[PDB]
Design a protein around this ligand. Structure first.
Ligand SMILES: COc1ccc(-c2nnn(CCN)n2)cc1
Ligand SMILES: [Yb+3]
Ligand SMILES: [Yb+3]
Ligand SMILES: [Zn+2]
Length: 607
């Protein structure tokens, strides 16, 4: 049972295809059109079905060229409103029909962000982007909004002629709109069945540059050059991922670099990964996000979680594959460094929620929980830790990668649960069941807190980070003179980030220590978003008033939730900046991404 959906489940009926014909109106901030759903009955004598909707205006429902009766139920908070459709003729098992729904979105759709020209790089044209994961596809179009149903899709999108539309699909041409010469129609085809959270749309003043045989980078003109360089390793990563997961089935692998309010680091939209512009560090150091998004082309997009309670299947296996890609490119010591860093992020998430919090369980129960509120590093890192522990228990990376490839092959184009995964793990490792039976499954899968066992990690690249962090933590006023810019000479950007992560775990540090750190290391000059974020959190938690305008600027100039949420929270927790944090949120709220605005509001206790 998918407890996040109000629609008829997959056991009743299944959407096989969506044909979307829509028009984008920037003056009204609406998407208007028709969603033609090809539905297959799974039951005898089926006479009605229910779809998910959220803030949608429905004009009519057409089946067999005639209008049919439908009713929208009372709204169920974040789940939206169920839409019951009365079928004109009872359907037998396996019978298929086409249901054409004429709809319009609300300007406040939780799936969309409408940007004014002032919010874009070019300053001349507006911009629109979607973000359906987890349950926001229902805020764009009526659908069975559950990852347990997979469908193909075709779409025709009408937009003002000066703008470009892209979707999570293969581009199928453009023409002037035959109904309006001031507009263009962009066509799309997604021939591989996908869960509806993978439907995505962007409309804006977009330009492209080729960076690989199957990859274009898309962004506004101002970011194209920097993006092509930042993501130049994409093809090399795709070749490694194919070797690990089997064929890349999606055709194209394009990248879209969104405006700064994009709420996540990346979104694995098929054929067109969406990325935050905060990855544009200038040195490719944040490329693991591309490796992660590429990996989802197997773990998440091909093999999908049946319900959001099993989201760790998507994230845990993706982080596992991402870390193998980075390990192939940079070495096994680097894979262990990143894996150990991940354990640290898990420690942080567990400490933030509390060790008994239900959101720290690997398999969660999302009954009456908004998925956006439960979202965290837990499914990524606790999921990764489980797989890394199993890799060590089962004979190493080569052996465990054999399982990963077989798992992807077994469940391709399907939606599965934790029980399906565990059953297959036991089947594949039938000769190692004695070892598998030693795993504390109840603790790993269903208990809150840190996992019961911590994997073994090579420390080579981590040692220098820990040693420098410990020197600062144990330093007294008379030791401050010993620190110098030379302390960092042999540290990579990754190691500088880990040094800050280690130090931040012990924050606050004395104000004089943080002032000395700026004096000798000049961290204020670093633009790398990950390093800058950790440095500013360290400054604010250590009560440095000079950091207040820097932290407020980072929190608002970009909108990646990983950065924006903890920055606003740290600023609200610092007495000197509390009022400024609340006022800044109130002033920016109306122009923020709808999900980010909701979450920052909840974090700040501002309604
Ligand atoms: C289970 O609840 C949730 C809520 C939000 C998300 C989400 N949106 N974007 N991302 C990053 C790309 N996969 N994740 C996922 C799951
Ligand atoms: Yb074609
Ligand atoms: Yb001393
Ligand atoms: Zn992911």
């Amino acid at each position: 049972v998918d407890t996040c959906s109000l629609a008829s489940p997959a056991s009743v009926c299944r959407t096989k295809h969506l044909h979307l014909r829509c028009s984008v109106d920037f003056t009204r901030r609406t998407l208007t059109g028709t969603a033609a759903l090809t539905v297959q009955s799974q039951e005898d004598n089926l006479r009605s079905l229910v779809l998910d909707t959220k803030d949608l205006t429905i004009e009519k429902v057409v089946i067999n060229g005639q209008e049919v009766k439908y009713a929208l139920g009372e709204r169920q908070s974040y789940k939206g409103s169920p839409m019951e459709i009365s079928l004109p003729i009872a359907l037998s098992k396996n019978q298929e029909i086409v249901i054409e729904i004429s709809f319009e979105t609300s300007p406040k759709s939780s799936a969309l962000q409408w940007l004014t020209p002032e919010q874009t790089s070019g300053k001349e044209h507006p911009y629109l982007f979607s973000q359906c994961q987890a349950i926001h596809c229902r805020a764009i179009l009526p659908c069975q909004d559950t990852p347990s149903v997979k469908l193909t899709y075709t779409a025709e999108v009408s937009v003002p002629k000066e703008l470009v539309a892209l979707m999570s699909a293969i581009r199928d041409g453009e023409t002037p709109d035959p109904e309006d010469p001031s507009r263009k129609i962009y066509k799309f085809i997604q021939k591989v069945p996908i869960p509806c959270y993978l439907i995505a749309l962007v409309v804006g003043a977009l330009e492209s540059r080729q960076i690989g045989p199957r990859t274009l980078v898309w962004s506004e003109k101002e970011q194209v050059e920097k993006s092509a360089y930042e993501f130049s390793e994409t093809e090399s990563m795709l070749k490694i991922a194919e070797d690990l997961g089997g064929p890349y089935v999606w055709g194209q692998y394009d990248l879209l670099v969104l405006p700064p309010s994009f709420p996540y680091g990346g979104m694995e939209n098929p054929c067109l990964t969406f990325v935050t512009p905060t990855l544009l560090a200038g040195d490719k150091s944040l490329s693991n996000v591309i490796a992660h998004e590429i990996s989802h082309s197997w773990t998440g997009n091909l093999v999908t979680n049946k319900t959001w309670d099993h989201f760790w299947l998507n994230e845990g296996h993706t982080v596992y594959l991402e870390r193998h890609i980075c390990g192939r490119l940079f070495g096994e010591k680097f894979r262990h460094f990143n894996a150990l860093g991940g354990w640290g992020e898990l420690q942080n998430s567990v400490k933030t929620f509390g060790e008994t919090h239900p959101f720290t369980k690997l398999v969660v129960d999302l009954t009456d929980i908004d998925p956006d509120v439960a979202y965290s590093s837990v499914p990524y890192e606790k999921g990764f830790a489980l797989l890394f522990y199993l890799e060590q228990l089962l004979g190493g990376p080569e052996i465990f990668l054999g399982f990963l490839k077989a798992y992807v092959e077994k469940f391709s184009y399907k939606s599965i649960t934790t029980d399906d995964w565990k059953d297959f793990l036991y089947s594949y490792f039938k000769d190692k069941v004695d070892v598998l039976n030693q795993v504390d499954w109840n603790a790993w899968l269903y208990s809150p807190g840190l996992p019961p066992i911590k994997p073994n990690y090579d420390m080579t690249l981590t040692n220098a980070c820990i040693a420098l962090s410990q020197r600062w933590i144990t330093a007294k006023e008379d030791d401050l003179n010993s620190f110098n810019a030379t302390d960092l000479k042999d540290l990579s950007s990754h190691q500088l980030n880990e040094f800050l992560a280690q130090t931040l775990q012990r924050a606050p540090l004395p104000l004089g220590h943080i002032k000395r750190m700026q004096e000798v290391y000049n961290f204020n000059a670093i633009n790398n978003s990950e390093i800058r974020f950790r440095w500013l959190r360290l400054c604010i938690q250590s009560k440095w008033e000079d950091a207040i305008p820097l932290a407020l600027k980072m929190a608002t100039e970009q909108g990646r939730m990983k950065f924006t949420r903890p920055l606003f929270k740290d600023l609200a927790a610092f007495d000197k900046s509390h009022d400024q944090a609340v006022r800044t949120y109130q002033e920016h709220k109306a122009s923020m991404h709808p999900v980010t605005a909701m979450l920052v509001g909840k974090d700040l206790k501002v309604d």
